[PDB]
Design a protein around this ligand. Structure first.
Ligand SMILES: NC(=O)C1=CN([C@@H]2O[C@H](COP(=O)(O)OP(=O)(O)OC[C@H]3O[C@@H](n4cnc5c(N)ncnc54)[C@H](OP(=O)(O)O)[C@@H]3O)[C@@H](O)[C@H]2O)C=CC1
Lengths: 81, 185, 177, 123, 89, 355
């Protein structure tokens, strides 16, 4: 669990569009925090899958809409858990 | 003039040492196969030096002509990864490499002699000091050479081994087919 | 004693009008003549560039006009070739491929533009899908006129190119330089 | 039968904005995942982030288009370009058509006020 | 007697201490057989005998068939796996 | 539409009393009115210069000696724009012909080595004097000399000595002359910098790799010459086009080696031996390092602070560590892929051997 959120919250603040430099938490919505529009929600899952060296499907890369869903999907051990 | 061709055998020994070290150290294996070809050539040279050019040529037309063609024919088609020679990975073998070298060499040299004291068995191997006289007689009447003799004994005295090598070659045909060719139909 | 003067001659004739009068000059002229003899008697174009209007170029490979009699051989590959023949239309979808083939050729290299559609775009000059001249991409040494230029025009153009290379200075220019 | 090439999608005109939203998002995702391939295949002289920036710009271009049929047309054209790029059909020139900015500054005077345009007869 | 023993020993050591690939293993086997044949042919000359050269020609045959079978086996491994990695057999 | 990015106006007037009306939007067909003359367009810098001039329709007169090196310039413009003349500094009429109808003149002449027909003096001093006297006779409005960095009238290097004498003679005959002083230029197919560090089997330094300098991209110097040819404020002036970042030779070589992913070979053998080996290599017909250049290996770049710079032309000169990737990626070998592990299980699904 700490193996993931550590790099996750890394790539979230590496994403410059977040108006908050320091408002990344679990239970931080990608959308209603307004940190991200719908395109950036895809740019981020993109940067995450390539950070961890994986490629997420389409249906589930739609379902990933917050930090909890991301950490819980990397938990499945595709690679680089 | 005379002694310009005295140390050719020692030269081939030194060169075989070099080609072995190069086969072991090369990065891309293709180069290692090229050095193996250099080694088969040096062996063919040495065999000419000691009076067996027929085997020199049989080597060049068997080993180099087929086996090494095939080795390149394989490494050209397969994705044989590697790990370049290093110091983190292979240095650990140096004590064992050295012990194994010394023991295996001294034993491979002591083994060929029948003396009872050990050290003398090696000092006999290091006794390559004296020249061998060659006399000329007149009893050989024909033009028999080594290949003719090999044919005579192989096809008369040792026929059974020939008629078994035929079956070894049948394996060389039939096993690779069975392994590669899937008789799904 | 650092140099601080110059006996630099004026009125030194230009290469076009520079006659030989010294043994070094006759020697360099002979070496240049032999190199150019080689360049002339073996004139190998590359198979690329022959898109449109390849029929008239193939007729120069035919019996009545044999190009091989002059040592011409068409080659599949640039790397063995010296000459490029931009026949036919040079479209915008093709120009980068042309420049690749031209940069791949080893120097010395020439270019000869066969036809109107390759010299100035010809008939399709005002089209959306055309380069209005192969000059825009590559440097051209000879322009054959026609559409399609007659086999005789191509041979004459090659005889103008052989003349260009024959009045070329390889070593004499170095003896100037 | 004449079969489709690699990344071909059958042209299908969605009747709703809610489905085309999803299809456009998948296209954007594919562009982003494939951008490093767009940097390797085409000998590129800049960053993968700059490619992703240009992609975001090209998708922001038509962000405010509410006519459904025009959106379907735009999506089909974009999938065409993805197929053109990821399969190595385009060459370098046709790709760097999308990156004028990266090339060196074209000269000095780039008029932005009236008087300069008048002195250059561009007003 | 020297050169053969040396190629044999060095090739056994390079067979044993190869942490890199497998083609070195094939090569070291072939070189070991070479060194054997040189030992034997040297002895066959010094004795002026033929049994040594007979066993030598037989070794050449058997070694070539060995390499054929080995390089079909490798092809089977590769059929299934697709890559012959540095530390796989 | 296209633009005249080089010109600020369409009606320009030279200092010789010619009116030059621009025509077009600034593409291949346009004309700037101007007529220039570039004495070394066959070379490394002049090629980029004629490209930038003739992209906008400026007529370009290009004196040449070898007919075959030049042909790569005719591409750079429409018909009638690029015009060629055969010329030699030992013929005066040729130089008057080249400069007669010109509003602008550009002298890029100068070898980094000596020859049998031209020593450093004859090509950097007398050639400049000949061109200057013709620029003066015909009263050409503009003259834009280029004289190497670190130039100083008396110096250990004969090259910099001549380059300094070429400066003072040009400026003592043509008072309105503009002088540029570029620092070591780099780019694609450079002479003695990146193609060498990327191709040469082994480097050598009679010093250590310690000679300090400010290098610069050649395209930017060409942009500078473009922004000086048309700006008449730059008469009787002097420029130092050096670049933001100071780089020692060893620093450049380490960046070159990092980007190439190959270990560049450097030796660092002493001065007299290298100086002798260079001297003996000057008898073969192809260019090589010459005894006077290992002398410049001990002469770091002294920048003149009294002269204008890039920022006097609204330019933002580029940085070496960014551009080295673009310039050295072709020699990048790119041996293979990293870390093939975690791919056996994926490869196992595909058919590798058909029957
Ligand atoms: N490149 C650099 O790093 C630096 C360059 N400079 C200066 O800037 C200029 C750039 O030249 P560069 O870019 O180096 O490429 P070159 O130095 O190769 O340009 C040389 C040009 O000068 C011409 N030329 C040389 N000698 C003669 C001669 N004797 N008679 C007639 N023409 C001659 C050549 O013509 P051809 O090619 O037909 O022989 C060529 O066109 C030079 O003046 C150089 O001193 C200064 C500092 C650094």
């Amino acid at each position: 669990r700490p193996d993931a959120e550590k790099r996750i919250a890394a790539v979230l603040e590496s994403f410059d569009k977040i108006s908050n430099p320091a408002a990344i938490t679990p239970t931080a919505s990608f959308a209603k925090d307004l940190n991200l529009d719908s395109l950036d929600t895809v740019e981020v899952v993109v940067a995450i899958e390539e950070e961890f060296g994986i490629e997420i499907p389409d249906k589930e890369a739609d379902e990933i809409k917050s930090v909890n869903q991301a950490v819980e999907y990397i938990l499945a051990q595709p690679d680089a858990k | 003039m005379m002694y310009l061709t005295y140390y050719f055998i020692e030269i081939t020994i030194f060169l075989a040492i070099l080609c072995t070290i190069f086969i072991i150290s090369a990065k891309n294996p293709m180069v290692s196969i090229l050095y193996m070809i250099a080694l088969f050539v040096i062996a063919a040279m040495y065999l000419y030096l000691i009076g067996l050019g027929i085997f020199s040529l049989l080597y060049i037309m068997i080993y180099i002509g087929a086996i090494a063609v095939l080795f390149l024919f394989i490494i050209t088609l397969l994705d044989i990864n590697s790990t370049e020679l290093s110091v983190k990975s292979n240095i650990r073998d140096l004590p064992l490499v050295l012990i194994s070298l010394i023991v295996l060499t001294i034993s491979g040299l002591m083994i060929y002699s029948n003396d009872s004291i050990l050290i003398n068995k090696l000092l006999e191997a290091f006794g390559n000091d004296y020249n061998t006289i060659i006399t000329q007689d007149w009893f050989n009447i024909e033009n028999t050479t080594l290949l003719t003799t090999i044919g005579n004994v192989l096809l008369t005295n040792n026929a059974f081994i020939l008629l078994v090598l035929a079956i070894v070659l049948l394996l060389g045909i039939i096993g690779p087919i069975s392994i590669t060719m899937k008789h799904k139909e | 004693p650092r140099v601080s003067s110059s006996s630099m001659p004026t009125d030194f004739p230009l290469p076009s009008q520079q006659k030989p009068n010294s043994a070094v000059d006759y020697t360099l002229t002979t070496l240049d003549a032999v190199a150019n003899w080689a360049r002339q008697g073996s004139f190998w174009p590359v198979t690329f560039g022959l898109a449109c209007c390849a029929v008239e170029m193939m007729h120069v490979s035919a019996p009545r006009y044999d190009q091989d009699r002059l040592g011409i051989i068409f080659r599949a590959s640039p790397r063995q070739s010296d000459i490029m023949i931009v026949a036919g239309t040079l479209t915008n979808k093709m120009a980068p491929v042309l420049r690749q083939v031209y940069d791949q050729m080893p120097e010395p290299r020439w270019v000869i533009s066969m036809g109107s559609c390759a010299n100035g775009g010809g008939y399709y000059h005002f089209s959306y899908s055309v380069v209005r001249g192969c000059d825009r991409i590559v440097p051209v040494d000879v322009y054959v006129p026609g559409c399609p230029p007659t086999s005789e025009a191509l041979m004459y153009g090659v005889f103008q190119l052989q003349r260009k290379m024959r009045n070329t200075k390889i070593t004499r220019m170095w003896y100037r330089k | 039968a004449i079969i489709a090439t690699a990344f071909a999608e059958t042209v299908k005109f969605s009747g709703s904005k809610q489905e085309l939203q999803k299809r456009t998002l998948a296209l954007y995702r594919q562009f982003l995942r494939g951008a490093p391939t767009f940097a390797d295949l085409y000998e590129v002289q800049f960053s993968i982030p700059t490619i992703r920036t240009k992609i975001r710009q090209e998708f922001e271009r038509h962000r405010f288009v509410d006519d459904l049929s025009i959106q379907n047309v735009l999506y089909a054209k974009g999938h065409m370009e993805y197929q053109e790029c990821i399969n190595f059909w385009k060459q370098q020139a046709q790709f760097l058509k999308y990156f004028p900015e990266e090339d060196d500054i074209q000269g000095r005077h780039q008029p932005s006020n009236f008087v300069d345009k008048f002195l250059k007869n561009r007003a | 007697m020297f050169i053969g023993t040396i190629i044999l020993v060095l090739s056994f050591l390079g067979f044993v201490f190869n942490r890199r690939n497998i083609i070195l293993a094939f090569i070291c086997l072939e070189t070991m057989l070479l060194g054997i044949n040189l030992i034997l042919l040297r002895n066959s000359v010094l004795f002026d005998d033929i049994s040594g050269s007979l066993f030598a020609i037989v070794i050449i045959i058997l070694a070539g068939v060995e390499s054929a079978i080995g390089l079909s086996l490798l092809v089977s491994y590769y059929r299934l796996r697709g890559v012959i990695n540095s530390y796989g057999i | 539409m296209n633009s005249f990015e080089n010109l600020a106006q369409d009606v320009n007037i030279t200092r010789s009393g010619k009116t030059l009306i621009a025509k077009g939007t600034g593409g291949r067909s346009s004309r700037t009115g101007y007529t220039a003359t570039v004495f070394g367009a066959n070379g490394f810098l002049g090629s980029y210069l004629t490209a930038k001039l003739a992209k906008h329709g400026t007529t370009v007169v290009v004196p040449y000696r070898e007919e075959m090196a030049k042909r790569h310039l005719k591409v750079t413009g429409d018909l009638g724009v690029v015009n060629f003349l055969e010329m030699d500094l030992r013929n005066l009429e040729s130089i008057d012909e080249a400069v007669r109808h010109s509003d602008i003149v550009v002298n890029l002449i100068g070898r980094e080595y000596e020859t049998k027909n031209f020593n450093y003096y004859d090509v950097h001093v007398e050639g400049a004097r000949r061109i200057a006297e013709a620029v003066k006779k015909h009263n050409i409005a503009r003259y834009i000399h280029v004289s190497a960095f670190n130039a100083e009238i008396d110096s250990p290097s004969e090259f910099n000595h001549t380059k300094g004498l070429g400066e003072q003679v040009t400026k003592d005959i043509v008072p309105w002359a503009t002088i540029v002083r570029p620092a070591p230029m780099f780019g694609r197919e450079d002479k003695w910098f990146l193609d060498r560090m990327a191709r040469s089997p082994c480097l050598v330094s009679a010093n250590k790799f310690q000679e300090t300098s400010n290098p610069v991209h050649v395209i930017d110097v060409a942009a500078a010459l473009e922004r000086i040819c048309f700006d008449d404020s730059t008469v009787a002036q002097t420029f130092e086009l050096y670049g933001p970042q100071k780089f020692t030779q060893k620093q450049i070589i380490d960046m070159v080696s990092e980007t190439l992913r190959k270990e560049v070979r450097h030796i660092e053998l002493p001065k007299a031996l290298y100086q002798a080996y260079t001297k003996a290599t000057q008898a073969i017909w192809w260019p090589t390092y010459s005894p006077d250049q290992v002398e410049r290996q001990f002469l770091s770049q002294k920048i003149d602070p009294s002269a204008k710079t890039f920022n006097d032309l609204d330019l933002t000169p580029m940085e070496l560590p960014d551009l080295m990737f673009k310039l050295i990626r072709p020699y990048r070998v790119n041996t293979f892929q990293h870390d093939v592990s975690q791919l056996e299980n994926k490869e196992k699904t595909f058919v590798h051997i058909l029957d």
